[PDB]
Design a protein around this ligand. Structure first.
Ligand SMILES: Nc1ncnc2c1ncn2[C@@H]1O[C@H](COP(=O)(O)OP(=O)(O)OP(=O)(O)O)[C@@H](O)[C@H]1O
Ligand SMILES: [Mg+2]
Length: 468
């Protein structure tokens, strides 16, 4: 049975790269009727962030993914936090020492710096310390690390399921640290011990870890374990071909959520990063992704993660995938956040209908249609100047509107049409000043649809305010 996993580090915001990797791990598992598990890599007691674990778990669920074993749900092969299995790594490191596959190294930071500059990296000199002498020094409390004893000379063959076999000269593989002087493990030791004990059969991770694989293959060999299948996903790239980074762009899944991006849209977009549908469709469900999933369709080139394309997909979901009622429900949290209310559901539905063609994110709705829910809306500098320019025209029009019995889009349109002809001006000369007065903006949906929405009295009231 296929068993995949994700091993996120709770060191900050939930990263989009984590969602991307999680998505493919989840799909490969579900397509094979297997299991997808979550294991928290929280050994870095320096970068640990309280609440980061919960936020990453929440983000995965928000996206529509689910997992079968993890910190909160539990599982048969836990603990599911590496910080809760520190004793296991120490015991496995000791097993490697016993097998001659590891050794204790006592160099100080200053010594390592000198060796590094002299040899180009650590040269494994501690391998020549008599084993019993190394144990005695350790027993006496001398600080040290446990390193992998790479076979010198030798070669290590590694297979990535998407790229093929690579033959590494062991000279390219250093005697990496497996257990740190503080008793904590490095990812090299932790991932191998945990993937094995959790029954992971398919390791799917970012390509930046590809060159680290021979170290892991050496570890599986050292323990006498069977190595799992390895799949390295191409890194997400910026339009300029550079690797996306949290230090250069928005990578926080919480930011996307707060900005009004729909989880179904973002999930759909990540699906297009390292994969394409046969017929080429770009809009599809998570289930369709799983049903169509195959490694044969996963591109190796660097996938471009473009915010403009994401926004486009978000908007397409907003006006072509969801129903008007679903959209109305989802903008509610954003209206409340903006401190706005709605008289009724029928009114909200109408406002959403009028604005639907004008916003790509849920957060833009309250921002662009604030004047529809309150009188406390901003008046642009451009709209104010336009209002001032047409004030005399509006002043003369006011009486007509007040005496206007038929208050409908068509009637109002006809009224302004006649008025413009009467004043010898084009409809637009009257329409724009009026839009500014009623909305504080020069860009809104149909002027006449907006002028009839609130109602004569409510419309006149706001107009008098603008004319005052
Ligand atoms: N461009 C990317 N494509 C895919 N996965 C990525 C990408 N960048 C980071 N990741 C993954 O996201 C997770 C978080 O990595 P990390 O915290 O280093 O973010 P980062 O953007 O790489 O920041 P930094 O630039 O400092 O390295 C890791 O699992 C990492 O492999
Ligand atoms: Mg990084």
């Amino acid at each position: 049975m296929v068993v995949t996993r994700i091993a996120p580090s709770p060191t900050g915001d939930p990263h989009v790269g984590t969602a991307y990797i999680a998505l493919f791990n989840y799909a490969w598992a579900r397509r094979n009727g297997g299991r997808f598990i979550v294991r928290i890599e929280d050994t870095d007691r320096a970068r640990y962030v309280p609440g980061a674990e919960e936020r990453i778990l929440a983000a995965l669920k928000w996206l529509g993914l689910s997992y079968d074993e993890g910190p909160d749900v539990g599982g048969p092969h836990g603990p599911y936090r590496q910080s809760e299995r520190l004793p296991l790594y120490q015991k496995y490191a000791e097993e490697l020492l016993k097998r001659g596959w590891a050794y204790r190294a006592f160099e100080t930071p200053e010594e390592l710096e000198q060796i590094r500059k002299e040899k180009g990296g650590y040269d494994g000199r501690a391998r020549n310390i008599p084993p019993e002498e190394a144990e005695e020094r350790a027993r006496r409390g001398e600080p040290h690390v446990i390193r992998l004893k790479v076979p010198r000379p030798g070669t290590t063959e590694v297979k990535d399921e998407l790229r093929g076999v690579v033959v590494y000269d062991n000279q390219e593989i250093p005697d990496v640290v497996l257990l740190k002087s503080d008793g904590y493990p490095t990812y090299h030791l932790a991932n191998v011990v945990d993937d094995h004990l959790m029954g992971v059969t398919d390791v799917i991770r970012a390509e930046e870890w590809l060159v680290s694989t021979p170290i892991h293959v050496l570890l599986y060999r050292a323990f006498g374990w069977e190595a799992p299948r390895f799949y390295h996903m191409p890194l997400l790239r910026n339009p300029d071909k550079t690797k996306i980074s949290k230090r250069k762009s928005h990578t926080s899944l919480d930011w996307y959520k707060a900005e009004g991006f729909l989880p179904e849209a973002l999930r759909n977009y990540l699906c297009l990063m390292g994969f394409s549908m046969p017929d080429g469709r770009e809009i599809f469900t998570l289930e369709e992704f799983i049903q169509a999933f195959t490694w044969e369709r996963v591109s190796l080139g660097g996938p471009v993660f473009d915010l403009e394309k994401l926004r486009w997909m978000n908007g397409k979901y907003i006006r072509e995938v969801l129903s008007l009622e679903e959209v109305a429900e989802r903008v509610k949290p954003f209206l409340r956040e903006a401190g706005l209310s709605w008289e009724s559901e029928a009114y909200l539905r109408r406002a959403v209908e009028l604005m639907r063609p004008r916003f790509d994110t849920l957060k833009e709705f309250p921002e662009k249609a604030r004047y529809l829910f309150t009188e406390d809306y901003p008046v642009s500098e451009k709209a104010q100047r336009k209002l001032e320019e047409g004030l005399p025209l509006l002043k003369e029009l006011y009486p007509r509107l007040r005496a206007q019995e038929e208050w409908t889009e068509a009637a109002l349109e006809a009224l302004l049409r006649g008025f413009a002809a009467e004043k010898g001006v084009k409809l637009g000369q009257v329409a724009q000043p009026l839009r500014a007065a009623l909305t504080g903006s020069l860009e809104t949906p149909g002027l006449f649809e907006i002028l009839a929405l609130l109602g004569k009295e409510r419309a006149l009231r706001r107009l008098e305010r603008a004319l005052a």
